[PDB]
Amino acid sequence: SNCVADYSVLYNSASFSTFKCYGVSPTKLNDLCFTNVYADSFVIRGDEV
């Protein structure tokens, strides 16, 4: 939080396994700007997605 969060820099990596949002539109990710962001960052096995 308390920063500028661009998602066009999130989009240009075309190596994502599953690039899908469940809250909002995935093309509207730069459009809608949030209040707080909670990133649950971890590394697990590829079939548990």
């Binding site: 909002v24 093309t27 509207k28 459009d31 809608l32």
Partner: protein, 49 residues
Amino acid sequence: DVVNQNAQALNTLVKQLSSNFGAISSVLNDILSRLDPPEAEVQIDRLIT
């Protein structure tokens, strides 16, 4: 009594607008600003119904 009956009917019709009706939210503007035109169809269909 007739005046209060008319007033209750109008105020219930007003209070129906904030009802979620099973959709994600009640206000159409956030649904337009957060979902695709092939993805907002179901929720806007819920609200219209």
